[PDB]
Amino acid sequence: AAGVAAWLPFARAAAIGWMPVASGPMPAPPRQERKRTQDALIVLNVSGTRFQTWQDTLERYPDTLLGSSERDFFYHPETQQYFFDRDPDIFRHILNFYRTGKLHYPRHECISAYDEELAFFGLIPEIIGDCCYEEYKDRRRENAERLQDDADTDTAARQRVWRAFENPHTSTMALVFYYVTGFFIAVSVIANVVETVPCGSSPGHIKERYAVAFFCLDTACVMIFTVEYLLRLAAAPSRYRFVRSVMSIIDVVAILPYYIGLVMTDNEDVSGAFVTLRVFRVFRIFKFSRHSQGLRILGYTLKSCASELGFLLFSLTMAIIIFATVMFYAEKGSSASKFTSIPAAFWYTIVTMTTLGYGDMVPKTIAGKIFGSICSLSGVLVIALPVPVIVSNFSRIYHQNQRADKRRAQKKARLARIRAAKSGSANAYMQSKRSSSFETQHHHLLHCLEKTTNHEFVD
Amino acid sequence: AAGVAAWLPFARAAAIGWMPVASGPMPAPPRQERKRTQDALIVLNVSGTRFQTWQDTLERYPDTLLGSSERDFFYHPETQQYFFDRDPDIFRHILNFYRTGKLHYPRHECISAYDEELAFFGLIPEIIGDCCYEEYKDRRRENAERLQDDADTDTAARQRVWRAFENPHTSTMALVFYYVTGFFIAVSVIANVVETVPCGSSPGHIKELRYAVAFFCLDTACVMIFTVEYLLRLAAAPSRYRFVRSVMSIIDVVAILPYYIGLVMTDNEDVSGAFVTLRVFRVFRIFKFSRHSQGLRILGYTLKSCASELGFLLFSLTMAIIIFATVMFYAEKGSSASKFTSIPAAFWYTIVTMTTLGYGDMVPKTIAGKIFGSICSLSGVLVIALPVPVIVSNFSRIYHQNQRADKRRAQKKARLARIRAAKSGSANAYMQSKRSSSFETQHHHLLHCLEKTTNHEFVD
Amino acid sequence: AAGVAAWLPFARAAAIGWMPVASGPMPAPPRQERKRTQDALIVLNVSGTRFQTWQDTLERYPDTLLGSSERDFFYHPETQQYFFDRDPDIFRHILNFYR
Amino acid sequence: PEGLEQLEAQTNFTKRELQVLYRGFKNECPSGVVNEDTFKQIYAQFFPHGDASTYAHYLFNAFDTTQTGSVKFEDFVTALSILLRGTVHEKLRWTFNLYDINKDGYINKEEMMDIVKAIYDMMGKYTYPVLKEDTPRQHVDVFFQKMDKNKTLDEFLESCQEDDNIMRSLQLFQNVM
């Protein structure tokens, strides 16, 4: 490597190994200099104290800024030294790297400062040793998501109400429509549940109540929902991506059952589909998605931990199979023999997975009870395996939600500070027009612009 | 501003853009001392460590203390260099700020010292370029609430008397005052409990022929104690109506009012199914252990703290109960047992399985019924387990918060005692000086002058 | 406190507040010295680099080791400085505390 | 407060001593503007005896012109320079201002009792002669003795030099430092 130049003369001695083998013109060493060592401990004073290093130590990596004559841009001639104006402690790590050829990242420093110091000295971030590289990568990813959140979104016609619509806490009309459609979803699901009660839609008194008025309550509500969906069809920034969004899928799934039942009863009386209609009528519960602040958090959390839940599914299925087979095979000889099949044992294994317990189905042989107890314990551990990951992701996302709110407030404060500084500069220019060394030339350029545009500046 | 004042010549090139479009008298440059940056780097010492740097960088931001000319007090001309006595590595961050334009905060240094060194150099706290701002603000908030805990400033004719009553331990007085009240509340609640057992007070063993109705007198006596203690607390409260709104005060009033309203009902016109409700309300006296148990206050304050996520819990479990009750009810409406008579009936079946409770009172019979019931059980255990850890974390956090608050209050009393000891030592040192390293001599002379102007002296 | 000696002359001015009320022998300031300030930035080199501090800054807490003439045990005469052989970064915190 | 414009002019202190004064000022109040409570603490700390809150309060109210709520460095250094190295005749104007609490330049036998009781609370509770409850008003009458009997700043100014004690007390700190 280029950093082991001090061992270069030793390789010269290696020629003696093949020198009797060597035979040729030997164009001789190319005008070598300084037979005796004249290594100068060149001094590099960085905003204060100084660091001395050998010339070959600084020149073993000429590809960087400190190599070649580029460093002489920061050379200080009247003092006979290199007065760099950079941070004097990251330079220490740079010097250690130059000596070693390997750079270590100390843990307790800001990544922004470290990276801009790296860029100032013409280095690459990929030379960090694996001992420090993993930590630097963690810090990179955390500050990267930080800066991503710093500039995610900014609030910026007929489509304009769309921004009001999808941010209902902007205008009174959007907020009232949002609240009232939530009330409509709630009243529709309440209408369904109070339809199911015997007092409303059962022959409680055949002698005499059964109101068919509820048959209207859904339809109107359904039509109401349609309009906002149609609203999102009208002010759609994306015609197809909006439908591809899961929200739209949930909305259309909740909307469809009334119309599909209309079509069915218009054409058929398919058995088993009307009850399916009633079942699917409930997905206004899922339509509550926008009103529920945390339901989006729950969905994103479930999406994030997909592999963990899949592994849970696989493990619980395997445990259910094993235990159900064992208990059916070791219990089929019982008198009652409620373990009549492997599916019959499935229900017992699944009620003993979750410490649920019904007593309707219990083993009656000595092996049965002990296998059931072991089954219960194994189910407990299996089901408890992924819940820490699930709740960790949920709480995490909750934390990024609140911290993103705080960061948005911080960015608003910072833009206010920037505009305040702009106003301060403007009024400073105005008072200079009415009445440091830098401000003299600043206002000189301002007056030159005024002359070239012949437009005087007022308060 | 001047933050890029090293780029002024380039801006002059920008002026070159607009001469052919110009129309003016051209007042010419306003002249200057030198048309260069020959201002040499200045060496400035901070507690024996010299930080050489360019002057133009310092006047790049004159608005701070280091800018303008208010730095010349710390200048040390007889060797021709600025001297300071601040923390070198901390000031190194301000130096990096001046070099760049944005400030950073190390996450391994005391936030308080960072704060007074920040204010010392005449720079705004929020000049951090939002890369260290988050942990800076978190540490600032942490130590701010730490000092707020430090500043609890608890104090010690009736104004001090009712505080001593409020004091948990005044040896002779408070121990009696609280133990006797705890005994009253305990006997009251146990009496309200035991009036139900057949042999205790009921016709459970009197049908053949003890059932002495005298625990009513005990209830009257204990509610009398409750109301007289509430009157004493009202006399204790500096603001009568405002401290009526206290949580403990509302507990007291809702524990004492059932007795009065029931006795008013005794001679009032009777309404069916109303005495049972008051007899239910009788048990609220158990809530009086708030003054006895600190853990109850901890739990209540935790619930008041972590409330939004509990709302999301209840809302989520409502969706779960509705969905799964509907799917069960339509899954096994028509069967042999037909246990799911209605959605309110399915409410019980689903609620006994979100919590993994398990009765066997009423169970699914259709294959889809069993499958979706198992799914319901799993979903419910997930839902109920979702907010438990944040609840327990908040509870433990508040517990340790109050624990360390008590510890630091003891520590601050100890350091106040040390300060008083130091004051006594200073007084004794002055006494010794009066009877018989130049600052102390001047101080003694000054205090002698204070004695002279008041023609008074001090004696041990 | 003993660490606010730089404000001691200001308290002298406070006498003018009660001076018309003052009446007595006034034994006068006790042989004061150095009317003009001669604060020396005394150097303390600790196993390497140096830290400079004002004499009153180091002497405002004489109860400690760095007060009084005890510090002169570590005084280095041939170099005109205080070469302490302790850790050079905790001494930084000690200096900040002294200040 | 530029460090050189505030030379012996308008602040009777050399720039080398001004550097020390500003350094000591900033080391305790880095903000550059001293608050009232900071002044109370920095004044009462040198006395381990009884409190000095009220006397320091009046001192600050005299220091704090235009009711800023806090004093910056320029007024502080000006007042300190006048009080320490001022003119024999000129010094007592600010002394009267200290003893003038009712704003207008008049005394009605009540702006001075409070100052005396604040001063005499300094002695603590182990004083060699016990401060009787009538002793504060007794010394108030003692100070009234030199004050004009007829119905002040002018009489006090023209009678201060009559009593040699005050004049010889000015030179206690006029020459020192």
Side-chain angles (χ1 to χ4, degrees):
Chain A
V4 193
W7 290 65
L8 173 58
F10 166 72
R12 281 193 207 261
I16 312 303
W18 64 77
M19 167 189 79
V21 182
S23 301
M26 64 183 73
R31 50 187 270 269
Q32 66 94 20
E33 294 179 353
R34 49 195 69 258
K35 195 173 284 308
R36 77 162 305 159
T37 48
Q38 213 270 320
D39 50 346
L41 276 300
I42 193 148
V43 289
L44 319 170
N45 46 320
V46 290
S47 70
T49 190
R50 34 149 187 92
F51 302 82
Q52 314 201 357
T53 184
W54 286 272
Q55 180 44 240
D56 71 325
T57 309
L58 196 60
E59 216 62 32
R60 41 198 52 170
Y61 287 77
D63 314 330
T64 79
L65 187 135
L66 277 296
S68 74
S69 172
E70 170 48 55
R71 62 185 175 188
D72 296 290
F73 278 98
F74 311 145
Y75 179 74
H76 211 267
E78 57 261 33
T79 52
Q80 189 53 256
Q81 46 185 16
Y82 279 93
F83 178 66
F84 310 96
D85 212 12
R86 286 332 287 184
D87 189 283
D89 202 1
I90 296 90
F91 174 39
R92 179 191 88 130
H93 311 102
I94 308 169
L95 186 151
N96 304 314
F97 149 72
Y98 271 127
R99 174 256 314 284
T100 60
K102 181 43 89 182
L103 182 61
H104 286 290
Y105 167 67
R107 187 262 311 155
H108 50 289
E109 292 82 4
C110 175
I111 279 294
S112 50
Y114 204 99
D115 177 82
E116 61 205 290
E117 286 278 319
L118 186 151
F120 201 104
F121 286 72
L123 272 298
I124 193 72
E126 278 52 38
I127 53 174
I128 309 294
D130 183 76
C131 46
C132 314
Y133 181 80
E134 166 86 343
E135 213 284 339
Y136 150 72
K137 196 43 81 150
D138 314 331
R139 296 279 176 174
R140 164 170 281 175
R141 88 200 61 175
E142 54 90 19
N143 60 66
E145 63 90 21
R146 181 66 178 171
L147 60 90
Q148 171 254 329
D149 193 23
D150 286 323
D152 283 330
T153 181
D154 183 75
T155 61
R158 197 71 165 165
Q159 298 284 322
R160 183 82 276 169
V161 299
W162 174 255
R163 191 272 305 277
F165 187 76
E166 309 293 340
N167 201 351
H169 282 282
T170 293
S171 72
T172 285
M173 60 159 206
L175 190 60
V176 63
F177 187 43
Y178 184 70
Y179 265 77
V180 71
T181 190
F183 177 89
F184 292 165
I185 299 165
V187 75
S188 177
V189 66
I190 295 169
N192 197 343
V193 54
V194 309
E195 179 272 332
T196 45
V197 67
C199 313
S201 292
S202 84
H205 48 68
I206 302 102
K207 277 73 69 177
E208 305 208 10
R209 59 190 294 266
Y210 180 83
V212 75
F214 312 118
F215 172 73
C216 310
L217 276 162
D218 49 316
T219 71
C221 289
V222 167
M223 294 183 286
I224 300 165
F225 302 146
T226 59
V227 72
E228 55 253 34
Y229 160 63
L230 308 183
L231 189 148
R232 303 166 189 178
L233 284 159
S238 77
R239 183 82 194 278
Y240 180 70
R241 296 292 299 274
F242 159 74
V243 176
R244 191 65 193 269
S245 181
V246 184
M247 321 305 98
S248 164
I249 300 173
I250 310 305
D251 313 328
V252 301
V253 159
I255 283 292
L256 67 89
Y258 166 45
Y259 299 153
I260 193 66
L262 282 192
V263 161
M264 272 306 187
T265 196
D266 198 4
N267 289 319
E268 304 275 315
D269 190 9
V270 177
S271 70
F274 53 103
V275 295
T276 311
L277 158 62
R278 325 297 211 196
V279 163
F280 276 104
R281 292 176 66 188
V282 71
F283 283 19
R284 37 185 165 265
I285 292 303
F286 272 93
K287 186 72 179 69
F288 269 104
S289 47
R290 278 148 212 89
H291 281 62
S292 170
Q293 180 39 72
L295 182 59
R296 279 95 62 188
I297 310 172
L298 177 67
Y300 294 140
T301 304
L302 269 294
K303 191 163 153 65
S304 48
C305 58
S307 178
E308 298 76 354
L309 57 87
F311 178 56
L312 182 62
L313 183 63
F314 195 58
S315 297
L316 65 89
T317 59
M318 292 146 68
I320 288 166
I321 301 299
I322 295 162
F323 284 122
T325 51
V326 168
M327 313 198 72
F328 170 80
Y329 281 171
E331 283 280 329
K332 66 193 163 198
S334 53
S335 68
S337 180
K338 206 177 297 179
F339 295 152
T340 190
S341 53
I342 285 177
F346 277 166
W347 197 36
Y348 179 56
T349 61
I350 198 52
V351 299
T352 198
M353 281 315 78
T354 79
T355 80
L356 189 41
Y358 291 165
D360 49 11
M361 171 145 58
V362 300
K364 278 82 178 176
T365 78
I366 294 93
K369 275 85 76 176
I370 61 170
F371 278 113
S373 48
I374 284 180
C375 182
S376 63
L377 188 153
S378 281
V380 176
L381 65 92
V382 168
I383 66 172
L385 278 183
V387 55
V389 167
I390 297 169
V391 70
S392 310
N393 298 23
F394 183 91
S395 72
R396 184 186 62 193
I397 298 316
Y398 199 81
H399 292 94
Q400 288 88 20
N401 172 24
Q402 56 209 96
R403 173 222 43 70
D405 311 332
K406 267 71 179 174
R407 191 225 45 76
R408 187 144 50 251
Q410 196 271 349
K411 99 193 207 184
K412 291 189 288 292
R414 288 323 89 192
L415 66 92
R417 190 203 223 164
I418 291 299
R419 71 184 179 91
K422 286 183 180 180
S423 69
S425 296
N427 54 57
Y429 169 50
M430 271 315 327
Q431 67 89 28
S432 278
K433 182 82 73 174
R434 290 148 169 236
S435 51
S436 79
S437 298
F438 152 79
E439 61 86 20
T440 59
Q441 71 250 19
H442 193 197
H443 303 88
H444 168 69
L445 275 74
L446 278 163
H447 296 339
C448 286
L449 179 59
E450 201 272 319
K451 296 316 150 69
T452 195
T453 193
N454 64 268
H455 294 133
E456 202 267 338
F457 299 85
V458 286
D459 293 339
Chain B
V4 286
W7 288 64
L8 267 298
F10 164 76
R12 317 267 196 197
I16 311 174
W18 63 69
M19 283 74 75
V21 305
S23 62
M26 182 45 158
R31 297 285 74 78
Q32 78 282 337
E33 300 279 321
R34 59 199 93 182
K35 51 175 205 63
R36 280 174 292 117
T37 49
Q38 189 61 75
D39 293 330
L41 73 165
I42 65 154
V43 57
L44 59 90
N45 189 351
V46 286
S47 291
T49 60
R50 49 184 172 91
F51 287 169
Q52 296 158 351
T53 183
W54 292 14
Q55 188 51 257
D56 53 359
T57 62
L58 276 76
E59 60 255 10
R60 180 157 324 160
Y61 319 104
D63 283 33
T64 62
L65 170 66
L66 283 73
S68 77
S69 79
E70 276 75 10
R71 56 183 180 179
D72 305 330
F73 315 86
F74 321 133
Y75 197 78
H76 187 273
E78 59 272 16
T79 178
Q80 201 77 357
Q81 51 100 20
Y82 282 103
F83 185 90
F84 317 90
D85 208 359
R86 313 310 271 171
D87 189 358
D89 308 294
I90 290 182
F91 168 59
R92 180 149 79 81
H93 292 320
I94 297 89
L95 186 148
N96 301 310
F97 171 75
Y98 277 115
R99 152 199 296 113
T100 59
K102 67 184 292 294
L103 183 62
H104 295 190
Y105 170 57
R107 66 185 183 273
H108 46 258
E109 193 267 329
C110 180
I111 194 66
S112 55
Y114 209 83
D115 291 329
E116 69 274 15
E117 298 285 352
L118 187 153
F120 162 85
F121 289 101
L123 61 94
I124 301 299
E126 43 269 26
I127 66 170
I128 303 279
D130 74 3
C131 54
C132 303
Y133 159 82
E134 69 275 16
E135 72 272 25
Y136 182 76
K137 186 60 66 68
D138 301 323
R139 297 273 279 215
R140 175 67 178 271
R141 187 265 308 155
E142 187 276 322
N143 271 288
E145 55 87 15
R146 155 175 292 212
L147 273 296
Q148 202 53 260
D149 291 331
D150 291 331
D152 202 2
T153 174
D154 210 7
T155 81
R158 207 211 290 274
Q159 287 71 242
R160 51 96 178 171
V161 179
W162 74 265
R163 186 267 164 208
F165 295 161
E166 191 274 333
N167 183 358
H169 301 284
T170 72
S171 278
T172 302
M173 187 66 204
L175 284 178
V176 161
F177 186 32
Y178 290 134
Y179 267 98
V180 73
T181 310
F183 185 73
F184 296 136
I185 68 190
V187 301
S188 66
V189 60
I190 193 179
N192 280 101
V193 176
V194 300
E195 82 160 5
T196 300
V197 61
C199 59
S201 162
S202 68
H205 73 285
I206 312 297
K207 298 180 290 295
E208 170 194 57
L209 73 164
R210 304 293 189 186
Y211 186 13
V213 57
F215 308 143
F216 174 75
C217 308
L218 186 49
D219 186 74
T220 61
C222 203
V223 67
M224 182 179 72
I225 304 150
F226 293 146
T227 180
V228 302
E229 176 52 37
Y230 178 47
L231 265 295
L232 190 147
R233 296 286 104 185
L234 262 174
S239 288
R240 305 317 201 244
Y241 173 65
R242 315 309 304 120
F243 285 108
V244 161
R245 299 295 95 191
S246 181
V247 165
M248 283 73 74
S249 158
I250 198 168
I251 297 169
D252 302 329
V253 302
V254 307
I256 73 163
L257 69 88
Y259 169 83
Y260 287 159
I261 190 169
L263 287 187
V264 169
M265 183 177 176
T266 54
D267 50 348
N268 269 347
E269 50 173 11
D270 287 346
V271 178
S272 65
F275 65 106
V276 285
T277 308
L278 277 296
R279 183 55 64 193
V280 166
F281 292 155
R282 291 287 171 180
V283 302
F284 272 10
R285 41 174 50 80
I286 192 72
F287 276 101
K288 196 46 205 72
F289 294 82
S290 80
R291 266 73 181 271
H292 198 236
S293 173
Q294 68 282 11
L296 272 300
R297 282 160 260 139
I298 300 163
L299 188 150
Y301 289 172
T302 317
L303 265 69
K304 299 289 94 176
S305 69
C306 55
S308 73
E309 92 291 339
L310 194 151
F312 178 67
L313 180 63
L314 62 83
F315 182 75
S316 48
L317 61 83
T318 46
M319 283 75 74
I321 66 162
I322 301 299
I323 293 175
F324 285 109
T326 50
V327 71
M328 295 298 102
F329 173 70
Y330 287 144
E332 207 187 303
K333 180 67 174 66
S335 180
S336 45
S338 87
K339 269 273 198 181
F340 303 147
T341 61
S342 187
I343 283 297
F347 277 171
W348 197 29
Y349 169 70
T350 181
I351 200 60
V352 301
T353 198
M354 271 77 59
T355 77
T356 68
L357 186 39
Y359 291 165
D361 65 344
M362 81 205 198
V363 302
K365 306 287 175 45
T366 75
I367 320 291
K370 276 86 73 176
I371 290 308
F372 282 16
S374 61
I375 301 299
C376 180
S377 82
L378 271 300
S379 58
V381 75
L382 293 176
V383 163
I384 65 148
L386 188 153
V388 176
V390 66
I391 292 164
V392 308
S393 189
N394 196 2
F395 167 84
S396 85
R397 178 180 61 83
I398 289 182
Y399 187 97
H400 312 336
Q401 274 195 17
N402 70 56
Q403 184 50 48
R404 70 178 185 267
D406 214 358
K407 278 210 315 302
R408 68 172 55 191
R409 289 291 291 201
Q411 186 267 330
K412 72 180 292 295
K413 273 314 188 287
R415 65 168 187 66
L416 215 62
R418 190 194 49 183
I419 291 299
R420 285 159 89 85
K423 161 169 288 185
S424 170
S426 178
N428 215 57
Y430 175 75
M431 191 295 308
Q432 286 289 134
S433 176
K434 165 196 295 311
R435 172 187 290 117
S436 54
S437 180
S438 81
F439 167 74
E440 63 253 46
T441 289
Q442 311 201 11
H443 187 193
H444 296 131
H445 164 261
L446 191 45
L447 188 53
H448 286 323
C449 299
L450 276 296
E451 301 190 21
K452 178 261 289 181
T453 183
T454 187
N455 59 57
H456 277 43
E457 292 81 4
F458 314 117
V459 175
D460 290 312
Chain C
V4 193
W7 290 64
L8 173 58
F10 166 72
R12 281 193 207 261
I16 312 303
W18 63 77
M19 167 189 79
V21 182
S23 301
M26 64 183 73
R31 50 187 270 269
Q32 66 94 20
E33 294 179 353
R34 49 195 69 258
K35 195 173 284 307
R36 77 162 305 159
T37 49
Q38 213 270 320
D39 50 345
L41 276 300
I42 193 148
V43 289
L44 319 170
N45 46 320
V46 290
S47 70
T49 190
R50 34 149 187 92
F51 302 82
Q52 314 201 357
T53 184
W54 286 272
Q55 180 44 240
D56 71 325
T57 309
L58 196 60
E59 216 62 32
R60 41 198 52 170
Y61 287 77
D63 314 330
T64 79
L65 187 135
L66 277 296
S68 74
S69 172
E70 171 48 55
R71 62 185 175 188
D72 296 290
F73 278 98
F74 311 145
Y75 179 75
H76 211 267
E78 57 261 33
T79 52
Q80 189 53 256
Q81 46 185 16
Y82 279 93
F83 178 67
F84 310 96
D85 212 11
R86 286 332 287 184
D87 189 283
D89 202 1
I90 296 90
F91 174 39
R92 179 191 88 130
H93 311 102
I94 308 169
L95 186 151
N96 304 314
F97 149 72
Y98 271 127
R99 175 256 314 284
Chain D
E2 297 87 3
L4 186 67
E5 190 259 323
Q6 304 224 320
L7 197 59
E8 280 278 334
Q10 69 269 15
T11 59
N12 46 42
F13 285 130
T14 182
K15 87 189 195 160
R16 167 66 175 278
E17 194 188 6
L18 175 68
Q19 292 159 359
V20 174
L21 297 178
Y22 182 76
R23 187 179 329 279
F25 153 83
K26 175 158 263 285
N27 183 85
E28 290 327 284
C29 185
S31 184
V33 189
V34 172
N35 189 359
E36 276 96 6
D37 305 341
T38 303
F39 182 76
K40 316 293 179 288
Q41 183 34 30
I42 196 163
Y43 182 76
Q45 54 168 340
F46 297 122
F47 319 112
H49 311 334
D51 44 20
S53 70
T54 49
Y55 190 72
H57 182 74
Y58 293 102
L59 283 169
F60 202 104
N61 296 115
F63 263 82
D64 180 62
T65 181
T66 75
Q67 187 62 255
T68 71
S70 283
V71 287
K72 50 182 61 61
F73 182 64
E74 50 182 8
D75 57 68
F76 186 27
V77 71
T78 290
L80 182 55
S81 84
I82 297 304
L83 263 52
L84 194 63
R85 321 297 309 284
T87 300
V88 181
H89 192 195
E90 182 65 26
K91 277 168 68 175
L92 286 199
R93 297 176 68 191
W94 292 270
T95 302
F96 163 73
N97 219 308
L98 294 174
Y99 293 135
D100 196 271
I101 306 173
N102 57 303
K103 309 312 172 291
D104 56 357
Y106 295 92
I107 190 167
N108 51 345
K109 306 290 98 175
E110 73 185 2
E111 286 89 9
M112 183 278 288
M113 200 146 77
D114 45 350
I115 302 185
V116 170
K117 77 173 187 273
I119 292 162
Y120 286 173
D121 205 11
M122 185 64 72
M123 320 186 254
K125 308 300 157 277
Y126 292 165
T127 303
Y128 166 71
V130 176
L131 198 63
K132 271 72 178 173
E133 290 76 49
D134 308 317
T135 49
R137 64 177 58 90
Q138 206 256 326
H139 215 279
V140 162
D141 309 340
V142 168
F143 205 60
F144 280 158
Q145 300 304 119
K146 66 198 83 164
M147 185 64 72
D148 57 326
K149 305 291 175 296
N150 47 7
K151 304 319 278 167
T152 319
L153 62 91
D154 48 358
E155 194 270 317
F156 170 73
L157 181 135
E158 66 183 1
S159 56
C160 72
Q161 78 273 18
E162 192 154 83
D163 192 67
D164 68 303
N165 220 344
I166 314 304
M167 311 295 108
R168 78 159 167 267
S169 67
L170 279 73
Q171 293 103 28
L172 289 172
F173 304 144
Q174 167 65 255
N175 47 23
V176 171
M177 268 280 160

